[PDB]
Ligand binder design. Structure first.
Ligand code: NAG
Length: 341
């Protein structure tokens, strides 16, 4: 009695496992893209789906509200404080003299296009304070995996180094792909790197035995605050682009209370402390984040009547709506049209 929206064959597989062990309590709806899930839950042929901030924003505009959210810290959940996932931070080289004010024309390092930390928040922020939607021409050059092969945002990207170069590919083949990759891009070619708060740490002091990251220390980097002031890598709390919320399960409002109880029921058997976690573990997928982030310990209940605006938080909400004002998706446009806004 809960059609879950699975995206891709891998999630579908896991969703089938879940459907089986839950004794049909959970059914599965497979789609190609995550955005496809929003429509299917609207048409009632899907009940729930875990989304990231950007999609949550879209879902909300379409009238779908967050009902439960993942917690990545302690296994044990519902005690009223919306957990934070991480902080989106802009990093720069210590020995450089660049900052948020003279950022135009510099070289950037993004985790990948469409990503929350490396793209949505930064470009979302630049559009808000600048009014531009010309992201590809803001920076002189830069590496943003997933960008058009021949565009400034690909010039800084390296490839795999192998035969088929694969420059700018949104995959591990691209050296500058992901968080660790964006940092490396800053260390080797870029001016600024848009990653998360824990990135610099995870790759300094020798944690990363790689060559480019063997003699790197935290002091080699600084955070660029939106003031124009720079901060110590450890002060991300006082100098972050935005606080990113955890992924939220979104559903049609009238099925809100219904879905919670059924998911709680599911946690009780397949959660981290599931009575049956031995058969199937909801939050387990071999670090592949199938259905839920494997970093999930439990689902926290989002207060009833909580809209997407409240859940995302003003700052994040502002940057998302900001970014989306620039070439919005068909769904977002369709939903905004359907209403008054
Ligand atoms: C506090 C304030 O008024 N600023 C907001 C905030 O979303 C962000 O800090 C800024 C970008 O620098 O854009 C403005 O909309």
């Amino acid at each position: 009695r809960i059609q879950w929206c699975a995206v891709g064959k891998d999630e579908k597989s896991k969703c089938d496992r879940w459907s089986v062990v839950s004794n049909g309590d959970v059914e599965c709806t497979v789609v190609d893209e995550t955005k496809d899930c929003i429509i299917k839950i609207m048409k009632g042929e899907a009940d729930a789906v875990a989304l990231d901030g950007g999609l949550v924003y879209t879902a909300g505009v379409c009238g779908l509200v967050p009902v439960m959210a993942e917690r990545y810290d302690d296994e044990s959940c519902s005690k009223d404080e919306r957990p934070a996932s991480y902080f989106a931070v802009a990093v720069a080289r210590k020995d450089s003299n660049v900052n948020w004010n003279n950022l135009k024309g510099k070289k950037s390092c993004h985790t990948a296009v469409g990503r929350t930390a490396g793209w949505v928040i930064p470009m979302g922020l630049i559009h808000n304070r600048t009014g531009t939607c010309n992201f590809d021409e803001y920076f002189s050059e830069g590496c943003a995996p997933g960008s058009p092969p021949n565009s400034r945002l690909c010039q800084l990207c390296q490839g795999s180094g192998g035969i088929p170069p694969e420059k700018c590919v949104a995959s591990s083949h691209e050296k500058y792909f992901g968080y660790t990759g964006a940092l490396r891009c800053l260390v080797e070619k870029g001016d600024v790197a848009f990653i998360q708060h824990s990135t610099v740490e995870e790759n300094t002091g020798g944690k990363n035995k790689a060559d480019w990251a063997k003699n790197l220390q935290m002091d080699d980097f600084e955070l660029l605050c939106t003031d124009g002031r720079r901060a110590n890598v450890m002060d991300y709390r006082e100098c972050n682009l935005a606080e990113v919320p955890t992924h939220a399960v979104v559903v049609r409002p009238e099925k809100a209370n219904k879905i919670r109880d059924l998911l709680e029921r599911q946690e009780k058997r397949f959660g981290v402390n599931g009575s049956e976690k031995s058969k199937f573990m909801m939050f387990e997928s071999q670090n592949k984040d199938l259905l839920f982030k494997d970093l999930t310990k439990c689902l926290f209940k989002v207060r009833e009547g909580t809209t997407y605006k409240e859940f995302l938080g003003d700052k994040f909400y502002t940057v998302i709506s900001s970014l989306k004002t620039c070439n919005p998706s068909d769904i977002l446009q369709m939903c905004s049209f359907l209403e008054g806004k």
